[PDB]
Amino acid sequence: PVYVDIDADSAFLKALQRAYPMFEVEPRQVTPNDHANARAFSHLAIKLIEQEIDPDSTILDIGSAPARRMMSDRKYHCVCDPERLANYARKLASAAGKVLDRNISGKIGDLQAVMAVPDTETPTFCLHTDVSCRQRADVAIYQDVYAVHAPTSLYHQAIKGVRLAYWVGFDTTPFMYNAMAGAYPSYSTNWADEQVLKAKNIGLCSTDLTEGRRGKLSIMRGKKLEPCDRVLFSVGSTLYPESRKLLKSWHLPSVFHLKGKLSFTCRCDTVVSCEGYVVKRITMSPGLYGKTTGYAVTHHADGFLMCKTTDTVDGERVSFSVCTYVPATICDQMTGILATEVTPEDAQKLLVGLNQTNTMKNYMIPVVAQAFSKWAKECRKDMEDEKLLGVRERTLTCCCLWAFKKQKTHTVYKRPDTQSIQKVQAEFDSFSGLSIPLRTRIKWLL
Amino acid sequence: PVYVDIDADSAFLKALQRAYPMFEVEPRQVTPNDHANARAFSHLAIKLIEQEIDPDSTILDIGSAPARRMMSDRKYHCVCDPERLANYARKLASAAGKVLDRNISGKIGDLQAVMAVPDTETPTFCLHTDVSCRQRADVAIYQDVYAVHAPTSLYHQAIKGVRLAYWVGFDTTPFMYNAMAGAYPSYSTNWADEQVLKAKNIGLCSTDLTEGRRGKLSIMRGKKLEPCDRVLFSVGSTLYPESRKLLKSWHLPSVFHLKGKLSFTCRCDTVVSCEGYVVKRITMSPGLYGKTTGYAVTHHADGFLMCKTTDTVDGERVSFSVCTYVPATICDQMTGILATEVTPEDAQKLLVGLNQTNTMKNYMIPVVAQAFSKWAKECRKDMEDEKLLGVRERTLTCCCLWAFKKQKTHTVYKRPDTQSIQKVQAEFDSFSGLSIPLRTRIKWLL
Amino acid sequence: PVYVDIDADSAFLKALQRAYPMFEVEPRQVTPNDHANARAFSHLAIKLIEQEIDPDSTILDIGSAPARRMMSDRKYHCVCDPERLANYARKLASAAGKVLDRNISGKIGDLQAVMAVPDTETPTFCLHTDVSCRQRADVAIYQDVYAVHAPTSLYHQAIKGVRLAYWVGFDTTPFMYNAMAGAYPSYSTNWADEQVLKAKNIGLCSTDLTEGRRGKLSIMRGKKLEPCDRVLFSVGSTLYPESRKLLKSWHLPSVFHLKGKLSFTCRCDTVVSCEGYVVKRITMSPGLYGKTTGYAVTHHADGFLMCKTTDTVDGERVSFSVCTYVPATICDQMTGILATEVTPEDAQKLLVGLNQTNTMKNYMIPVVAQAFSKWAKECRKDMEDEKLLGVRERTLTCCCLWAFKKQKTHTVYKRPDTQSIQKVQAEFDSFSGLSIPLRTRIKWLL
Ligand SMILES: Nc1nc2c(ncn2[C@@H]2O[C@H](COP(=O)(O)OP(=O)(O)OP(=O)(O)O)[C@@H](O)[C@H]2O)c(=O)[nH]1
Ligand SMILES: Nc1nc2c(ncn2[C@@H]2O[C@H](COP(=O)(O)OP(=O)(O)OP(=O)(O)O)[C@@H](O)[C@H]2O)c(=O)[nH]1
Ligand SMILES: Nc1nc2c(ncn2[C@@H]2O[C@H](COP(=O)(O)OP(=O)(O)OP(=O)(O)O)[C@@H](O)[C@H]2O)c(=O)[nH]1
Ligand SMILES: [Zn+2]
Ligand SMILES: [Zn+2]
Ligand SMILES: [Zn+2]
């Protein structure tokens, strides 16, 4: 009943079936898409969201195209590109008379009204931003949108009567850990900070061959390579610029409060989670009931690794943090060997032996190996420097100020069935692009 | 007859069938819920409680929502949030005429009456707290509520006529042992003290990568790391703040007395106990019959561990207690190897060998190994420092005061078929949140 | 024909079938009860007692509730609490008309008469103590009651016409041996002296984690750790306070005499004995025929162990006696290796090898191993220090007083098919709790 454009022999099919046990996921490959897993997950997410909400509900579809929202019986108001709008108009024109069970005549009239007056708020389409839109609804969908501030957009939806919001996208946990780069290997996705795009051995990088004869000159002293706001995502071959702050804003706590002219008590729950791709359900309710701990929890069905790795960016040897997702079976099969101190070479050989058909992508096997090795070493150190129960050894420094020694932590390894917990903000109170040729082109197809 | 939203191949299905032999537990997975085991246990607990109590009984449903109690033939008066109330109203409106065997018309009238006047005490719903509620009933249910003071709530229910109360929730034994952190691994649950949330190797923590170059300073001197009242539970990805005193208050003794204007003799018995999740039955009777020993007993079907562990909280190497549950088969299979002194590495290798499908979650295996190792060592010490029968070696210290030497106890290991016994209090005598927009929203659906 | 609430795969089914060969014991598990074995044994004991005594007999049921004694055709005068009384009233009200073959109308009238005048001695119910009761009967049943003085209760029953009494409960032999703690592993039962409740490695204990840095001070000098009267039993999760003297009083000799206003010659025989749970038959006959040796004999179908063990109570390393029951097959399989001196570690490894499904509970395996080891050592000493036949080496000490050397006895091992014999007393001549709210509650259901 639900068909996914993936190969029938894909190992991701089992994971996607586990993530959606309510459907009968059937592989029907029609394209060689290199980010087919992400598309299949997003399609299944949209099907699940539609199944969850009432049929009589109007759905704000933030940051999307109506072309993919026309073959449905739900009232999708698509508020968010020119190519996608042209495709939506073309699909309207090519199905104007073939089927009439999707309000295609009404959608065509709505599009004509919008292209007539761009400020029109027709029930099925809008050209304003999620902030500038004023079409009241009760359900909001955020499918693969990351360049919007989460509390601001959620508040602007809530004041329009939206009580339920859905966010589909990659897990925000790697950016709350503040990794320099990282991978969602199951979805062929690699993201990197703009500063490390010239690296060598990460997922999303390109470097040139050099002999290292001349030491490159720079007008500025770096002396610090820590993550900056700009990041680049590559889902298959699709490139997307993102902001770290806008990504982290979507790492919402379990409870938060939007205070303004109207106040809302909102709850964020991750309802779907498959190998780095999450569907979060946000329930908004007017009022300021309860209290907020400002804590966001990410459960880990699969292992999550943030490891220090040494690469060469533009030929310069540097060290930075790299995140990755390790399959739960690989993490479980490494439990015994991580009891002792294992070298990265032995860890990598063991991972390759356990990966034999590959359970996990091999390009992350080396760094993961390093991570595991470091983790094991660190654990041994923790077992070799056992302290006393309920005491600390902070020393006085010439004043009333007390200081302790921080240990070398080169690996954060969240094993399967663990939970990462982050201190985030839970109280928020700080909340015309149409052109003549595009209008002419749209009208020519209507 | 009883269907649980868990995978048909779940190893927890056998344990849940064992915990509820009276029902035919059938796995019917419909959601990918990451805390599905806890939900299934709670659903089976509610089914068993309903089966136990008389059909003609009024049930006080404390700290819950009626959005999960309408599809029953039993008079559930729900006293305890905004989204859950909205879901209750939605479910009443969507099934107002479809089914008329659940007093849905009466429930809708009661909800409208409560909306008209928030102090109304309709037989099926109330908006007050359990203290503020005054609807007389004979049965109380405490499903997954831990933020209430147990003797106070029980007294306020008893003076309302409640003779039978049921408490469904995680076992309170770990908090009677004063563990800093702990796991209910079977339910994908990890709880941690707020102080150790920045740890590295516990179930519920998040730490950053550091080089240990700058020693972090602090305004105040810690010098002590003992559990504080504030703890955080993560059931799957669901985050709940809890108070240690409120959690311990529900570790009631077998017999206790509530003394006040009316006096009650209450008995607390654990009627269901599956791998860290307990259903407790409290029978309250007016009068002060008998005497109270002030002892609470927990039977351990599976192994219970509280072990000293060394981790890094915010990079500072510290030691604190961590609790966990070990499957009884794992504990029995470790009996022979614990006869000698085993290193944590060998213990972890043996545990991994015994875990081969995993009997226990692997993320608990390392610390468990440490615990077992320490336990073995301690036992050997006890066998190497054999004292004389019925004598003690307390020495005199310059006065009439006698002192003895305490031994290093780094592991409390309650084996399967053992009982932990705690001295608790057994004599107790020290016993308007509605908003206009919520009222309008609820009334819009009625 | 007799159904027991235990698992069909329970290994206790075979033992219970052997203990009751006259019944067809069928496992019908309906509850996950952690002390299901003890309940099944007690139910079979009551069935056998009923099958033994004549149908025309009135049965005094001492220290019990009628909520378990109405579904029978035998006249049960229940003399003994509030919750059980309410349960009995509820069961009477819920079966008043459905079944009329159990004299339920008469039972209801009797309960109403007792609630009218609390001194009434209705044939089927009483509110007085077993001493204050005056309803004549010929059969008395003491099911799981240990807080009454055995000769006093037996005499007060005998002067009321009781010629036959039945006592069902845990074997009193461990308390005649004066063990500090002990286990009935087959019934998931662990008992401990109040002083050793803060132990670490016994069945019923709880201790905390300590670094053993500060030596705890005490106002009093212990200098002795001997059993005190107060003990605590844990049957599964059910906690019972008990008196050592009251428990020992039920370790009656095979023949004893109750002398007073009326004199009786009584005989105590253990008619059922399963792995620590016994049913004793006491036959009372007026007159003082015969003579009493003052000896109580316990036959051991399975091994009984009282061994010195070293634990830490509240961190203090102490040694005290621990008792346990070892399966006869384990004891027989241990005969060969006990011919030599075996270490506790080797003994524990061998016991684990023999326990492979576990024949015995694993948490008793270590101490038992120690026991066995010590026993073997002691036996070797007895063989290495062979004396002369019919001579003793008592030495004179500056007086007419002779002294011998007592040997180290750290293990009492009563093997299967042996008998312990204790010197006990055999000549005994030293022999209003109702509340208004309870009366109103009972009357409301009648
Ligand atoms: N990081 C990031 N990923 C995105 C973003 N938008 C979409 N994606 C993901 O990247 C994939 C590529 O997007 P598209 O080229 O539009 O593919 P599509 O969404 O299936 O639609 P088509 O173009 O018709 O195939 C999508 O499947 C999304 O899962 C974005 O803004 N940021
Ligand atoms: N520690 C703790 N656990 C809780 C608390 N409330 C509920 N839980 C458990 O955590 C799980 C998550 O709660 P919910 O998100 O409400 O799930 P639910 O109770 O099954 O109801 P739904 O949201 O409809 O799924 C529940 O299954 C409970 O077993 C709480 O207050 N404290
Ligand atoms: N040591 C000791 N054990 C007891 C005593 N009374 C009962 N027991 C045992 O402990 C078990 C627990 O008692 P209960 O909770 O009343 O269980 P029950 O007798 O089967 O009756 P229910 O409560 O209906 O299950 C019983 O099965 C008895 O075998 C007692 O006074 N002292
Ligand atoms: Zn719009
Ligand atoms: Zn109410
Ligand atoms: Zn009587």
Residue numbers in the entry:
A (entry chain Q), B (entry chain O), C (entry chain M): 3 to 82, 89 to 364, 376 to 450, 458 to 472
Publication passage describing the model:
NsP1 is the membrane anchor for the complex, forming dodecameric pores that associate monotopically with the membrane in the necks of the spherules to gate their entrance. NsP1 possesses both N′7 methyltransferase and guanylyltransferase activity and reverses the order of these reactions.
The guanosine base fits in a hydrophobic pocket defined by residues D152, Y248, F241 (β10-11 lid), Y154 (β4-αD loop), and F178 (β5). Base stacking occurs in between D152 and Y248, where the latter residue changes rotamer relative to the SAM-bound and apo structures to become planar with the guanosine. However, relative to other N7 MTases, the GTP pocket is deeper in nsP1, and the guanosine base and ribose are bound further in the fold. The overall effect of this deeper binding pose compared to canonical N7 MTases is to align the alpha phosphate of the GTP with H37, a catalytic residue identified to form a phosphoramide bond in the m7GMP–nsP1 covalent intermediate. However, as for the SAM ligand, only the base and ribose of the GTP are clearly defined in the maps, suggesting that the phosphates are flexibly bound. The side chains of the positively charged arginine residues lining the path for the phosphates (R92, R70 and R41) are also disordered, with the exception of R41, which becomes ordered relative to the apo and SAM-bound structures and forms H-bonds to the poorly defined β and γ phosphates. In conclusion, the structure clearly shows that many of the residues essential for GTase transfer (see next section) are flexible with only GTP bound, and that further stabilization of the GTP by ligand binding in the SAM site is required for subsequent methyl transfer and GTase reactions.
